[PDB]
Enzyme design. Structure first.
Site, PDB file in Angstrom:
ATOM      1  N   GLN D  30      -0.812 109.407  45.187  1.00  0.00           N
ATOM      2  CA  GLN D  30       0.245 109.684  45.673  1.00  0.00           C
ATOM      3  C   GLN D  30       0.142 109.852  47.309  1.00  0.00           C
ATOM      4  O   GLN D  30       0.923 109.460  48.184  1.00  0.00           O
ATOM      5  CB  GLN D  30       1.014 110.989  45.282  1.00  0.00           C
ATOM      6  CG  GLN D  30       1.521 110.881  43.947  1.00  0.00           C
ATOM      7  CD  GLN D  30       2.954 110.103  44.062  1.00  0.00           C
ATOM      8  OE1 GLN D  30       3.785 110.337  44.858  1.00  0.00           O
ATOM      9  NE2 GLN D  30       3.221 109.268  43.115  1.00  0.00           N
ATOM     10  N   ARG D  52       0.724 101.648  51.165  1.00  0.00           N
ATOM     11  CA  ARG D  52      -0.391 101.131  50.303  1.00  0.00           C
ATOM     12  C   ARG D  52       0.085 101.345  48.663  1.00  0.00           C
ATOM     13  O   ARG D  52      -0.433 100.750  48.060  1.00  0.00           O
ATOM     14  CB  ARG D  52      -1.569 101.469  50.445  1.00  0.00           C
ATOM     15  CG  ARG D  52      -2.112 101.038  51.978  1.00  0.00           C
ATOM     16  CD  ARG D  52      -3.526 100.455  51.808  1.00  0.00           C
ATOM     17  NE  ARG D  52      -3.775  99.527  53.005  1.00  0.00           N
ATOM     18  CZ  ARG D  52      -3.834  98.165  53.195  1.00  0.00           C
ATOM     19  NH1 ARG D  52      -3.588  97.539  51.711  1.00  0.00           N
ATOM     20  NH2 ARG D  52      -3.994  97.693  54.036  1.00  0.00           N
ATOM     21  N   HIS D 121     -13.954 100.257  52.392  1.00  0.00           N
ATOM     22  CA  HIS D 121     -12.933 100.926  51.427  1.00  0.00           C
ATOM     23  C   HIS D 121     -13.153 100.769  49.843  1.00  0.00           C
ATOM     24  O   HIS D 121     -12.379 101.215  49.076  1.00  0.00           O
ATOM     25  CB  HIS D 121     -11.602 100.438  51.689  1.00  0.00           C
ATOM     26  CG  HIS D 121     -11.212  99.124  51.535  1.00  0.00           C
ATOM     27  ND1 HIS D 121     -11.571  98.063  52.554  1.00  0.00           N
ATOM     28  CD2 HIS D 121     -10.741  98.277  50.424  1.00  0.00           C
ATOM     29  CE1 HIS D 121     -11.171  96.769  52.102  1.00  0.00           C
ATOM     30  NE2 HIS D 121     -10.853  97.117  50.838  1.00  0.00           N
ATOM     31  N   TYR D 197       0.302  91.057  48.707  1.00  0.00           N
ATOM     32  CA  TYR D 197       0.469  91.343  50.085  1.00  0.00           C
ATOM     33  C   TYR D 197       0.934  90.124  50.934  1.00  0.00           C
ATOM     34  O   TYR D 197       1.680  90.497  51.652  1.00  0.00           O
ATOM     35  CB  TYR D 197      -0.937  91.882  50.733  1.00  0.00           C
ATOM     36  CG  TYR D 197      -1.896  91.342  51.230  1.00  0.00           C
ATOM     37  CD1 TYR D 197      -1.651  90.208  52.403  1.00  0.00           C
ATOM     38  CD2 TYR D 197      -3.290  91.130  50.586  1.00  0.00           C
ATOM     39  CE1 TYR D 197      -2.823  89.353  52.665  1.00  0.00           C
ATOM     40  CE2 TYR D 197      -4.287  90.184  50.955  1.00  0.00           C
ATOM     41  CZ  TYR D 197      -3.943  89.463  52.002  1.00  0.00           C
ATOM     42  OH  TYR D 197      -4.998  88.781  52.644  1.00  0.00           O
ATOM     43  N   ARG D 234      -5.018  73.716  37.296  1.00  0.00           N
ATOM     44  CA  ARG D 234      -4.891  72.287  37.158  1.00  0.00           C
ATOM     45  C   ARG D 234      -5.392  71.664  38.072  1.00  0.00           C
ATOM     46  O   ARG D 234      -5.131  72.270  39.519  1.00  0.00           O
ATOM     47  CB  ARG D 234      -3.491  72.126  36.635  1.00  0.00           C
ATOM     48  CG  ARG D 234      -3.107  70.679  36.902  1.00  0.00           C
ATOM     49  CD  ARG D 234      -3.099  69.994  35.482  1.00  0.00           C
ATOM     50  NE  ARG D 234      -2.747  68.778  35.669  1.00  0.00           N
ATOM     51  CZ  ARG D 234      -1.783  67.959  35.082  1.00  0.00           C
ATOM     52  NH1 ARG D 234      -0.823  68.881  34.360  1.00  0.00           N
ATOM     53  NH2 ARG D 234      -1.497  66.768  35.122  1.00  0.00           N
ATOM     54  N   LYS D 236      -4.360  69.003  40.119  1.00  0.00           N
ATOM     55  CA  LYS D 236      -3.459  68.631  40.960  1.00  0.00           C
ATOM     56  C   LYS D 236      -2.821  69.577  41.682  1.00  0.00           C
ATOM     57  O   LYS D 236      -1.777  69.585  42.729  1.00  0.00           O
ATOM     58  CB  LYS D 236      -2.357  67.695  40.155  1.00  0.00           C
ATOM     59  CG  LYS D 236      -1.279  68.550  39.474  1.00  0.00           C
ATOM     60  CD  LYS D 236      -0.292  67.673  38.954  1.00  0.00           C
ATOM     61  CE  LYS D 236       1.097  68.291  38.867  1.00  0.00           C
ATOM     62  NZ  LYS D 236       1.238  69.827  38.071  1.00  0.00           N
ATOM     63  N   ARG D 248      -2.523  82.240  54.473  1.00  0.00           N
ATOM     64  CA  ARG D 248      -3.257  83.502  54.755  1.00  0.00           C
ATOM     65  C   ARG D 248      -3.820  83.584  56.127  1.00  0.00           C
ATOM     66  O   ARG D 248      -3.425  84.248  57.033  1.00  0.00           O
ATOM     67  CB  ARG D 248      -4.545  83.925  54.001  1.00  0.00           C
ATOM     68  CG  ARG D 248      -5.301  84.756  54.087  1.00  0.00           C
ATOM     69  CD  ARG D 248      -6.484  84.979  53.341  1.00  0.00           C
ATOM     70  NE  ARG D 248      -7.649  86.073  53.714  1.00  0.00           N
ATOM     71  CZ  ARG D 248      -8.787  85.682  54.351  1.00  0.00           C
ATOM     72  NH1 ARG D 248      -9.194  84.604  54.745  1.00  0.00           N
ATOM     73  NH2 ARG D 248      -9.627  86.743  54.882  1.00  0.00           N
ATOM     74  N   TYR D 256      -1.327  89.857  61.594  1.00  0.00           N
ATOM     75  CA  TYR D 256      -2.215  91.015  61.258  1.00  0.00           C
ATOM     76  C   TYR D 256      -3.403  91.172  62.693  1.00  0.00           C
ATOM     77  O   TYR D 256      -3.902  92.121  62.799  1.00  0.00           O
ATOM     78  CB  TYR D 256      -3.112  90.740  60.287  1.00  0.00           C
ATOM     79  CG  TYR D 256      -2.370  90.278  58.942  1.00  0.00           C
ATOM     80  CD1 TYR D 256      -1.374  91.337  58.485  1.00  0.00           C
ATOM     81  CD2 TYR D 256      -2.726  89.508  58.034  1.00  0.00           C
ATOM     82  CE1 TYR D 256      -0.459  91.099  57.412  1.00  0.00           C
ATOM     83  CE2 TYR D 256      -2.082  89.242  56.683  1.00  0.00           C
ATOM     84  CZ  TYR D 256      -0.856  90.113  56.714  1.00  0.00           C
ATOM     85  OH  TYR D 256      -0.290  89.990  55.344  1.00  0.00           O
ATOM     86  N   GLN D 257      -3.392  90.034  63.123  1.00  0.00           N
ATOM     87  CA  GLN D 257      -4.058  90.018  64.499  1.00  0.00           C
ATOM     88  C   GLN D 257      -3.299  89.752  65.955  1.00  0.00           C
ATOM     89  O   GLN D 257      -3.818  89.040  66.848  1.00  0.00           O
ATOM     90  CB  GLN D 257      -5.264  88.988  64.611  1.00  0.00           C
ATOM     91  CG  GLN D 257      -6.008  88.840  63.115  1.00  0.00           C
ATOM     92  CD  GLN D 257      -6.850  90.403  63.148  1.00  0.00           C
ATOM     93  OE1 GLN D 257      -7.100  90.868  64.190  1.00  0.00           O
ATOM     94  NE2 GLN D 257      -6.985  90.619  61.946  1.00  0.00           N
TER      95      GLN D 257
HETATM   96  N1  LIG Z   1       3.584  71.751  44.473  1.00  0.00           N
HETATM   97  C1  LIG Z   1       4.877  72.261  44.068  1.00  0.00           C
HETATM   98  N2  LIG Z   1       5.489  73.505  44.052  1.00  0.00           N
HETATM   99  C2  LIG Z   1       6.451  73.852  43.355  1.00  0.00           C
HETATM  100  N3  LIG Z   1       7.198  73.166  42.486  1.00  0.00           N
HETATM  101  C3  LIG Z   1       6.514  71.959  42.055  1.00  0.00           C
HETATM  102  C4  LIG Z   1       5.500  71.472  42.949  1.00  0.00           C
HETATM  103  N4  LIG Z   1       5.080  70.299  42.121  1.00  0.00           N
HETATM  104  C5  LIG Z   1       5.995  69.901  41.358  1.00  0.00           C
HETATM  105  N5  LIG Z   1       7.120  71.112  41.173  1.00  0.00           N
HETATM  106  C6  LIG Z   1       8.202  71.150  40.201  1.00  0.00           C
HETATM  107  C7  LIG Z   1       8.833  69.938  40.220  1.00  0.00           C
HETATM  108  C8  LIG Z   1       9.214  69.865  38.760  1.00  0.00           C
HETATM  109  O1  LIG Z   1      10.397  70.497  38.556  1.00  0.00           O
HETATM  110  C9  LIG Z   1       8.192  70.990  38.134  1.00  0.00           C
HETATM  111  C10 LIG Z   1       7.222  70.033  37.553  1.00  0.00           C
HETATM  112  O2  LIG Z   1       6.160  69.773  38.393  1.00  0.00           O
HETATM  113  P1  LIG Z   1       4.849  68.890  37.856  1.00  0.00           P
HETATM  114  O3  LIG Z   1       3.899  69.858  37.651  1.00  0.00           O
HETATM  115  O4  LIG Z   1       4.456  67.835  39.104  1.00  0.00           O
HETATM  116  O5  LIG Z   1       5.279  68.053  36.707  1.00  0.00           O
HETATM  117  P2  LIG Z   1       4.658  66.688  36.267  1.00  0.00           P
HETATM  118  O6  LIG Z   1       5.200  66.201  34.988  1.00  0.00           O
HETATM  119  O7  LIG Z   1       4.999  65.558  37.246  1.00  0.00           O
HETATM  120  O8  LIG Z   1       3.085  66.960  36.018  1.00  0.00           O
HETATM  121  P3  LIG Z   1       2.122  66.340  34.735  1.00  0.00           P
HETATM  122  O9  LIG Z   1       3.032  65.506  33.969  1.00  0.00           O
HETATM  123  O10 LIG Z   1       1.017  65.744  35.070  1.00  0.00           O
HETATM  124  O11 LIG Z   1       1.580  67.669  34.013  1.00  0.00           O
HETATM  125  O12 LIG Z   1       7.779  71.614  39.241  1.00  0.00           O
END
Ligand SMILES: Nc1ncnc2c1ncn2[C@H]1C[C@H](O)[C@@H](COP(=O)(O)OP(=O)(O)OP(=O)(O)O)O1
Ligand SMILES: Nc1ncnc2c1ncn2[C@H]1C[C@H](O)[C@@H](COP(=O)(O)OP(=O)(O)OP(=O)(O)O)O1
Ligand SMILES: Nc1ncnc2c1ncn2[C@H]1C[C@H](O)[C@@H](COP(=O)(O)OP(=O)(O)OP(=O)(O)O)O1
Ligand SMILES: Nc1ncnc2c1ncn2[C@H]1C[C@H](O)[C@@H](COP(=O)(O)OP(=O)(O)OP(=O)(O)O)O1
Ligand SMILES: [Mg+2]
Ligand SMILES: [Mg+2]
Ligand SMILES: [Mg+2]
Ligand SMILES: [Mg+2]
EC number: 3.1.5.-
Lengths: 481, 481, 481, 481
Positions: D30, D52, D121, D197, D234, D236, D248, D256-257
């Site tokens: 607290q 915090r 900390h 944050y 993943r 991609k 950030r 922050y700065q």
């Molecule tokens: N960088 C992102 N940030 C937020 N939303 C996103 C982003 N990219 C794609 N989206 C959205 C779009 C779609 O509604 C949903 C799916 O994205 P996505 O992962 O690209 O599907 P996908 O079918 O093309 O990929 P994959 O088949 O390779 O798994 O999220």
């Protein structure tokens, strides 16, 4: 008459002047209710159902806000209600020229259907604005509210498309130069259109944006630069401007240039190409136009909206089957399958003239694997995307003027090294995506080998999933190690 | 076959099951991308561009959320993943039956086009669901994922439209009765559909909502009531529930029943009635249907969307002129003019059977004032709106079961007097709006005198601007002073 | 020198005038950074860490916004930059009089520590404003920016507490009466303070706010009413105004009068009461004041903040043990236990003169249940809360003036029957909460039986969980069956 | 003992486990209600009032979320209620060691007051965790819920501070290595604390953040790497990861700065340094400690919060004059004045020691211009700030494991050239800010001449307003034209 209030989810309650209302309540402007902002993005981001109409409203409102702010901070500039109404109108009308599915139409369709002409949505906007003015009796209304149609219409057009041709503009003299960087800024790309689509697109996509345009507005001043009057930004905001351009790029990579959204753009475009001969659009005095030729008569273009997609889709005419099956394949979600992504190296830039050869290059290949199925050039789709900061290889901030707290009238320039070392070293780059029209497992395995081997032969970047889709090919390239 | 991720601006990233994906990727479902959630509301609230597609996704997600939470808190209920999938599907599919412009179609058009039939978007949803299942071979996929295509399909249909037919349901036994309160609650009206449209409609309209469904889910339990297991809400949340219905009532008065939006809905409906005879939609094996008969063939209904609006608008055929000009009058923003709003007094309530005889009353009036025009019944439009808490004269909270913190399995009732004295004492009311089809400066004056004198002679509430628009009529009614 | 821009999460970037900056940068104003807006609410709603400082900025900003909007829509009212600055200052300074934990100080502590005085945070704000002006040399600074201290300071004080005394105000003449309706509305309660606390408190609590103040501002006008100039709202917005007060009532029922938050406020008040004798604050010229007496010397009061809590908590003096132990019982979360809530029936209204005699009535009860322990009046706490719409028994909108679209300067009244039949018919009500200072299960069990039996004997409403917490007592009551 | 629901504005309704409630409801936890997240940032960003405490709640919630999601997607990992509870507790407790004003305490105060110790900390959180555990009898409560105190506490400490010394951890074995990547990630810095944050700080500051942690969570898997089970993202999503580190970096430069916020941090630190000897805090068995040594006894540290600021500001004792008068110029807003900002080039790096030799250098300069005053080293403040991507000169994304859609179990690596050419080429940099302790116009002018001459003499970047603030000095350095 009096002013109308309209509630926009992005900007809140915006006030509209009777003249602007009169421009809005026409078929030419209302046409924008039927053209999606992000086109095929709606087939990926189910929230992106927004149209060009509301975006236009937001651009007009923001133009008015910035011009009014500059006017109240510095009365010496002699900005009049006439200047405000005009800039608002230019803002309202810079999207009038968009075709069905927006950027798909002028960025993909028109270059393929009519490769001899040079067409841009800006020019479409000026033509449609002229048609809009004449067919609805706007000139006397302009006169009623204090505009001088000859000077003012010119000023508006120049605001939308740049010079129609030393000071090149005819609508306003040099000491009002700052009226020209607002609606469409040809110098550095910082304008209210971007500011509105940042907020709207993000509101709808489910991505949030970190650029604060209201802050930029609060810190904007008019400065003296090389004997003309330009918008000056406070020096301390330079970082934000960089972030603005970073943000734009981000919005392109997650949303605007999404692989699936883009392949859906390609499929809709091919459908339109295979429907181009058999669809008749009624133009001037009964004369008949086609989808690809509607851009030559504005009475026809007026009736050219997203509806065309559905016309093909609900069509029964057998001449339209070839396109209709494509549009049906979008509904069944049977899309071309994504193979991979790579980038060019060195000083290699894929120029437009060779976009046509690439699937053949991909189809050649020197794989060396069990070749259970053969793919031919037609089975491949190659999409080249140019990612920039708005001015190709250049840095837009080198073209923005600043002011400081100790001398708010002294315009200065700010270079990159004065800001940070964590900024980019390049401001343009190319992405290459490859798809296969054959969706079966064997066609995918093959397409991947063809693709990666193609990437190796061209000395391109190694696919991120290289070691995956092509384990037997990747150790061919020694510098991918 | 694997899972799909979707980004929805309201709910964030939603996971979709392969079976759900398979249902979504059909024309019967994708059809909803071309039907706007709020219909004529987009012509008043430019943000309201959202369609029924994303709304359906959202209902489907929330149903799953609630049943999954209930499942995790109380394992004794033995809810299975199969029950979850059936409830999710029911969620996805309860909106499939909507016609062009949603509530305009079943609430205005069909009753005037087919006053002999009893039609609801619910039954349409059931029919189109049957059609969707059959035309795409969904049953084997259903079996593949562990469903029983006979018990389960029945369950889903009952979830959407209620009983087909003690225990009136056949899809699930009494001991899982609570599964019937999630997607469409016929008992009290509290369901996940309201929850999704509150958040979505508010997100897009630009007005914000004060109802927290995530909280309600957290505080929801299953308890035994009258020998069934029903969803019960925590007692201290009764206040929130009243507020929920208040929220519903608010959204209607601000947006869904906006005077201008309603007059645009009426004008479009009128256009459709004047185009019904001359427009043919291709149905089963080639047979042709009209807008008013498309609800009888699902492959035809499938092709009945908002697109119909534009087809009429882009028609060159003279048999459609009378229909085509009204919609053009919408583009030019030359709408029927709003005269006013009033309410009945005491306890007289306007039945549907008098909606047709009503403008004659307004024109039959005998206002004692120097006018300028005589108006006929055909010149007035009268719109009767029913505002209630979902169950007409009843209080829906009298039909909610609660539990207490000290005994979370013991259901209790809470009466209105136990909550607050600041709550409503009635739960239904009628609003009457009157418009004039003549827009000239003098016909409006007359129409106003007719309207107010009519309000006085029928002893209705005094219009808010009574003393200003008709100073000479208001003192006749002593009961307004 | 020049004006400062400050970033608020609620309102965005706000411009501050040098005079306002000058007023802000004083110990008297900066003191508000250490006084929490919601006091003990932060111990229930962990987001509610906001203090009175930022809220004040927001009130000043909104006051300035409204007064500027009225000035631009109607130049005929002759509003000057000076009027604007005075209204902004009044806005900034109406919270200066708040004590530690805000309303806990003025609503609970002072009435118990000094029951002979009549004290309000408004008078405190005026006093602290006088002290702020005199001690920091503001008058010469006021004169520099065009203010007349003699008139202007009076105007400001009157803006905060009303007349210090046939036009009763001396700071501004009747043709500027509307300026007295902005910062603190004594007529109907609609003012910018509410508008800021709705948005801020909701932003921080995790509750969403359904009132649009910007819309209200867009539709605000100055009209002629009974020989005075008042702020008037458009007729069509009367519903939004009712909804505003419903919103306020909701914020009170969910957050401000949360049972646990209120019991924490009560425990802290007891702390201060048992520490009052042992805590000495150095005020004007060295004289020493106590927490309960700091309100009579402003140099001491300046020093009276939330800090005191911690001062008691970190104290080593054994004379402060009694208070320090209660604050430690706040930290270990050993709070007084909530027994239940009930409200009077019929025409019964509980007067303040009877609040001290109530726990004695509660212990005097004789529940027919075998109790192992007896509880005495000392063990009970009874908190009576008055929930109203701001004007006790009246309907505040019976005191707002409206205008119509056809005649924007002609004020009219609108009655409740003209808006809806779904609105409240009462506008005040009392809630009674009973807590027990004994926390064990058996004392709780006992306290509940005592409580319910008391509710039965006094003919109050049946507690919502009555049948669960007191099963043996509820069937005695004829009107609860 | 049941489950507690808490309303957080960032995360909504969060569920807290009875054991977590028992940990939260202690003085040691607290205390965090009284320590500002951003410290002196609240004196620049009036919204930043959060402490915090409400950050700790959010970190615990997020830890629980990520580990539970990983547990649900891959049951093969055998995650138990025990692992989840331990991860949640670790989340809740990694902020316990923070001092007054958070980082200001450990980043500025301790090294100047006690330059001989190594205090962070991180260690403080472990120590304070032990103190909480022992002083509040939590261990038997841990046992009640199925935890094994001896391994589990060790696990918790190792999660906060890393190894307490080939597999270096004893709290959990190799097949649960990924559990060490959630609360505080030592490999790459991607952890849930940042996630909380970002959203919280942005919610309160008035800036919006574009990083979506929910998406990352949805796409997170456990992959096998070098005999460990590590968290895999993943492939991609690599772009998003770069953006994370960009956001950030943005949050640091805007908030922050902030130049003023840091000087306010510096002034408060100064007050504390001149007050360290005269302030005594009661610790173990009555023994008395100072602000700088309280970190050596946890029951003393427990009572060490932001309150000391007020203890100083409110002091009358003349030994505290030097400290009390400085905090007073903060209230009056007479701060050290900002003269400017610059950066080194090439391979010059400002070493940690030479931070002391810098005020001597700035005054040692000899600008040849009419200077009214000479300034000595004591008149200058020079603050060196390190801006990086979290791992000094390295790229954290080279330390992330990714997976592909076609084979979700094998981790792969991704290089920078595989992502984009628009990223930074360096990942660390130094900023130099110079302030002047004399606030008058001429001492300021002089300070500017000195500063720019120093920047020129040291071959640093040209100050952004260089040509404006020191016109007679900038034209001398040809590399600035
Ligand atoms: N960088 C992102 N940030 C937020 N939303 C996103 C982003 N990219 C794609 N989206 C959205 C779009 C779609 O509604 C949903 C799916 O994205 P996505 O992962 O690209 O599907 P996908 O079918 O093309 O990929 P994959 O088949 O390779 O798994 O999220
Ligand atoms: N209660 C409301 N709250 C917020 N926005 C509203 C509300 N009602 C309508 N809106 C929106 C819809 C429009 O975009 C804009 C204007 O609506 P509105 O005030 O009803 O104009 P109007 O033209 O229909 O009325 P009128 O012509 O009588 O002035 O605000
Ligand atoms: N980059 C930013 N984006 C958004 N808000 C910011 C940013 N920088 C600062 N703020 C906030 C903090 C303040 O509350 C407010 C203004 O700060 P700022 O513009 O830096 O004034 P300043 O006094 O520190 O510099 P100066 O005196 O030179 O104008 O906006
Ligand atoms: N109506 C509400 N809407 C949103 N948040 C609320 C509401 N009421 C309380 N809260 C907040 C405050 C708390 O942080 C959190 C939970 O509070 P609450 O449910 O009232 O706890 P409680 O003290 O009443 O538990 P208990 O059931 O034992 O009485 O949600
Ligand atoms: Mg209008
Ligand atoms: Mg996919
Ligand atoms: Mg400043
Ligand atoms: Mg509780």
């Amino acid at each position: 008459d009096t002013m109308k209030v309209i509630n926009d989810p992005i900007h809140g309650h915006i006030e509209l002047h009777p003249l602007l209302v009169r421009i809005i309540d026409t078929p030419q402007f209302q046409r924008l209710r039927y053209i999606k902002q992000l086109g095929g993005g709606y087939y990926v981001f189910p929230g992106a159902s927004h149209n060009r109409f509301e975006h236009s409203l937001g651009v007009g409102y923001l133009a008015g806000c910035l011009v009014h702010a500059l006017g109240e901070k510095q009365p010496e500039l002699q900005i009049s209600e006439r200047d405000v109404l005009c800039v608002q109108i230019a803002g309202l009308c810079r999207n009038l020229g968009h075709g069905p599915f927006s950027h798909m139409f002028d960025g993909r369709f028109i270059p393929l259907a009519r490769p001899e002409v040079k067409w841009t949505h800006e020019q479409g906007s000026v033509m449609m604005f002229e048609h809009l003015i004449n067919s609805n009796g706007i000139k006397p209304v302009m006169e009623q509210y204090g505009l001088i149609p000859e000077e003012d219409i010119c000023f508006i057009k120049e605001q939308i498309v740049g010079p129609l041709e030393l000071w090149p503009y005819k609508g306003r003299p040099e000491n009002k130069s700052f009226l020209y960087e607002i609606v469409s800024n040809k110098r550095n790309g910082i304008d209210v259109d971007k500011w509105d689509y940042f907020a709207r697109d993000c509101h709808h996509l489910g991505i949030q944006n970190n650029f604060d345009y209201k802050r930029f507005i609060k810190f904007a001043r008019v400065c003296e630069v090389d004997n003309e009057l330009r918008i000056c930004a406070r020096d301390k905001e330079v970082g934000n401007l960089y972030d603005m351009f970073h943000t734009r790029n981000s919005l392109h990579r997650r949303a605007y240039q999404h692989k699936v959204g883009n392949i859906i753009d390609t499929m809709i475009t091919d459908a339109f190409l295979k429907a181009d001969d058999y669809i008749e659009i009624t133009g001037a005095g009964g004369k008949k136009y086609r989808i690809s030729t509607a851009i030559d008569d504005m009475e026809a273009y007026t009736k050219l909206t997203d509806n065309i997609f559905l016309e093909i889709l609900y069509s029964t005419d057998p001449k339209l089957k070839d396109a209709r099956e494509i549009l049906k394949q979008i509904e069944y979600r049977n899309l071309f399958k994504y193979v991979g992504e790579t980038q060019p190296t060195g000083q290699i830039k894929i120029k437009r003239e060779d976009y046509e050869s690439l699937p053949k290059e991909v189809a050649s290949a020197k794989p060396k694997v069990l070749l259970d199925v053969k793919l031919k050039a037609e089975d491949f789709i190659v999409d080249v995307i140019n990612m920039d900061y708005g001015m190709q290889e250049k840095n837009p901030i080198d073209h923005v003027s600043f002011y400081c707290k100790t001398a708010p009238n002294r315009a200065i320039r700010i270079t990159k090294n004065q800001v940070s070392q964590l900024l980019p070293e390049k401001f343009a780059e190319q992405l290459i995506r490859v798809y296969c029209k054959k969706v079966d497992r064997k066609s995918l395995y093959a397409a991947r080998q063809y693709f990666v081997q193609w990437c190796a032969d061209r000395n391109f970047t190694k696919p991120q999933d290289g070691d995956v889709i092509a384990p037997l090919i990747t150790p061919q390239k020694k510098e991918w190690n």
